[PDB]
Ligand binder design. Structure first.
Ligand SMILES: N=C(N)c1ccc(/C=N/c2ccc(Br)cc2)cc1
Ligand SMILES: [Ca+2]
Length: 223
């Protein structure tokens, strides 16, 4: 997260860190046994880390639970990043509490102008590299489909939306991949892509979760 703020320990209780020896992606806890992330976060050997603030220090509220299975969206295209969504099942159910909590799926798609919260442990610099140990947060509006398409001609599908600031300086970044965009207490987006980070006229692009609610629910019901 570039140009954001320190969230505060366990203030984003649905935020998870995916760890394969090291943090490599965020995700969102959607019930006691399932996490939503980006398809481009797929790899084997995933441990889900819940209740994290400082990902380098055991602070006392963590739950570390290995994934039993990952399900990448059947229509995920790694070239275009269309359908950039995946589900990860925990080997055992997380213990839910004030600091480890699921986030609701949307009942309807959020509109341009809606203020959302984007969070992650990704790079905090737009040029160069600095990775924070603690969770970073950014409040950002959903942008119009037209401004999104204008920023990224030929690249925005019906399964993507832009959020952030055309002026630049505030954005998600590498390492935030797979993490949440939450608007009015609903998971509306997943950190997916962008040209660099926090660049003028290159806002963040997010997987449009509201298009996947049926797939998510049906997949969970049978797996
Ligand atoms: N500016 C942004 N909001 C932004 C930029 C880049 C990313 C990560 N992008 C990747 C996508 C696919 C792979 Br594989 C590796 C990295 C995420 C967000
Ligand atoms: Ca920790």
């Amino acid at each position: 997260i570039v140009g954001g703020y320190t969230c505060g320990a366990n203030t984003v209780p649905y935020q998870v860190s995916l760890n394969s020896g090291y943090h490599f992606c965020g995700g969102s806890l959607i019930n006691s046994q399932w996490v939503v992330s980006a398809a481009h976060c797929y790899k084997s050997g995933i441990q889900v880390r819940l209740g994290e603030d400082n990902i380098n220090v055991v602070e006392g509220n963590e739950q570390f639970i290995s994934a039993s299975k990952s399900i990448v969206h059947p229509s995920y295209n790694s070239n275009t990043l269309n359908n950039d969504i995946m589900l990860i099942k925990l080997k055992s159910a997380a213990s839910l509490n004030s600091r480890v909590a699921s986030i609701s799926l949307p009942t309807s798609c959020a509109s341009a102008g809606t203020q959302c919260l984007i969070s992650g442990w990704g790079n905090t610099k737009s040029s160069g590299t600095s990775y924070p140990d603690v969770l970073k947060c950014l409040k950002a509006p959903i942008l119009s489909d037209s401004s999104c398409k204008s920023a990224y001609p030929g690249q925005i599908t019906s399964n993507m939306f832009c959020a952030g600031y055309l002026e630049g300086g505030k954005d998600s970044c590498q390492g935030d991949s797979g993490g949440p965009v939450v608007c009015s207490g609903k998971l509306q987006g997943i950190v997916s892509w962008g040209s660099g980070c926090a660049q003028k006229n290159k806002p963040g692009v997010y997987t449009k979760v509201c298009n996947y609610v049926s797939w998510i629910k049906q997949t969970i019901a049978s797996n």
